[PDB]
Amino acid sequence: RVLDVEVYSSRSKVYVAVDGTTVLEDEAREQGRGIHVIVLNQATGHVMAKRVFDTYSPHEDEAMVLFLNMVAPGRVLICTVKDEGSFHLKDTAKALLRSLGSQAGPALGWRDTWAFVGRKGGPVFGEKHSKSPALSSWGDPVLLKTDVPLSSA
Numbered sequence: 001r002v003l004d005v006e007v008y009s010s011r012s013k014v015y016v017a018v019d020g021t022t023v024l025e026d027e028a029r030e031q032g033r034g035i036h037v038i039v040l041n042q043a044t045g046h047v048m049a050k051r052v053f054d055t056y057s058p059h060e061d062e063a064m065v066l067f068l069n070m071v072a073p074g075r076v077l078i079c080t081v082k083d084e085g086s087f088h089l090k091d092t093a094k095a096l097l098r099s100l101g102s103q104a105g106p107a108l109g110w111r112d113t114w115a116f117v118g119r120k121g122g123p124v125f126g127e128k129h130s131k132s133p134a135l136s137s138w139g140d141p142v143l144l145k146t147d148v149p150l151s152s153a
């Protein structure tokens with residue numbers, strides 16, 4: 001009646017594991033920057049969608065907002081940052097993350113790392129965030145492990 005969810009955010013690598021199986025992994029040297037989003041079915045844990053939005057670059061946050069607004073309430077929503085996710089994560093996107101209950105997402109800054117697991121329509125199940133200490137540095141890798149309650153019947 002639970003999912004064991006692991007979410008990793010760092011400068012050079014992201015991954016998400018569900019019940020000990022890796023369902024998302026990106027350690028490619030020159031791609032995959034931004035906020036990785038995975039959507040799970042809330043009863044089975046099956047992956048319903050996988051996206052990456054390069055919110056270091058303009059317009060990607062707009063795509064993220066349009067995608068997240070079509071996600072059903074009650075899906076499991078997982079986010080994790082590779083390299084940089086904040087430069088063009090602008091106010092509408094930050095307000096949407098705030099509306100999910102995220103604490104770190106609306107506050108995300110330059111080269112911060114961030115891992116998030118929540119029910120789309122509330123509540124938040126797990127969140128971690130490491131602030132970058134300097135413009136030339138990155139946040140510390142963060143590894144969030146969270147038991148997510150499953151729906152039944």
Ligand SMILES: CC(=O)N[C@H]1[C@H](O[C@H]2[C@H](O)[C@@H](CO)O[C@@H](Oc3ccc([N+](=O)[O-])cc3)[C@@H]2NC(C)=O)O[C@H](CO)[C@H](O)[C@@H]1O
Nearest residue numbers: 028029030031032033056083084085087110111135136138
């Ligand atoms: C060497 C390297 O990391 N290059 C990769 C490049 O990395 C981008 C990086 O995504 C962004 C965000 O962290 O930062 C760029 O670096 C700077 C450096 C200085 C400033 N400044 O305002 O003074 C801003 C950004 C970095 N680019 C460089 C040249 O270091 O990203 C591309 C696309 O992902 C490749 O991955 C490349 O490998």
